[PDB]
Write a protein that holds these residues in place. Sequence first.
Motif, mmCIF file in Angstrom:
data_model
loop_
_atom_site.group_PDB
_atom_site.id
_atom_site.type_symbol
_atom_site.label_atom_id
_atom_site.label_comp_id
_atom_site.label_asym_id
_atom_site.label_seq_id
_atom_site.Cartn_x
_atom_site.Cartn_y
_atom_site.Cartn_z
ATOM 1 N N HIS A 194 -1.685 -6.159 -1.555
ATOM 2 C CA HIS A 194 -2.694 -5.131 -1.760
ATOM 3 C C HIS A 194 -2.574 -4.072 -0.675
ATOM 4 O O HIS A 194 -2.592 -2.873 -0.956
ATOM 5 N N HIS A 201 -8.957 -3.030 -1.546
ATOM 6 C CA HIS A 201 -9.446 -2.513 -2.818
ATOM 7 C C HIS A 201 -10.276 -1.256 -2.592
ATOM 8 O O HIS A 201 -10.043 -0.223 -3.217
ATOM 9 N N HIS A 219 -13.741 -3.791 -8.046
ATOM 10 C CA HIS A 219 -13.151 -3.877 -9.376
ATOM 11 C C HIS A 219 -14.065 -3.234 -10.412
ATOM 12 O O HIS A 219 -13.600 -2.599 -11.356
ATOM 13 N N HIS A 263 -10.217 -7.948 -14.636
ATOM 14 C CA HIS A 263 -8.787 -7.865 -14.922
ATOM 15 C C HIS A 263 -8.513 -7.730 -16.417
ATOM 16 O O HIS A 263 -7.576 -7.044 -16.822
HETATM 17 BR BR LIG Z 1 -7.565 -9.496 -7.276
#
Ligand SMILES: [Br-]
Lengths: 29, 27, 29, 28, 28, 29
Positions: free
Chosen positions: C24, D24, E24, F24
């Motif tokens: 990442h 992230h 996310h 995801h």
């Molecule tokens: Br992930």
Amino acid sequence: GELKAIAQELKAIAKELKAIAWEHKAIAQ
Amino acid sequence: GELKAIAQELKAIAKELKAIAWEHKAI
Amino acid sequence: GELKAIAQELKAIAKELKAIAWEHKAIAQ
Amino acid sequence: GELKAIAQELKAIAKELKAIAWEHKAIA
Amino acid sequence: GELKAIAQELKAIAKELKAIAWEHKAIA
Amino acid sequence: GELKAIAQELKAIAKELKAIAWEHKAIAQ
Ligand SMILES: [Br-]
């Protein structure tokens, strides 16, 4: 038992991880 | 034993994470 | 011992999450 | 002892999870 | 306790996991 | 008990994983 329930949660966790691992594999076309 | 079993599930977990680490190295 | 076994699998786990962290980190940089 | 070793591995796990989260957030 | 300590680290793990899902959620 | 406390955090962990797992999948779509 509570040890058994601990293994049960670890088992559910493993399969969620199983699925994600599969998404990454699929997404890799 | 239920401790042995617990260890087995952690083993499976590390296995999936390994697969995931790779698919990241693969994308 | 069985508790040692558990601690060893958690070490392995911690390792893979390290590798994932690096990948990442890579994507970013 | 062994229960300790388990907590410290968990700690390390939590730390690596935090690393992933940071990466992230850092994409944008 | 040691067991108590394990629960706290697991609670920390849950928290970092919740942060990953949040980032996310921002992408997706 | 402390073992139940542990099993409950593992339940919370599975939940977030599940959510990430569904994240995801949405990308896969
Ligand atoms: Br992930």
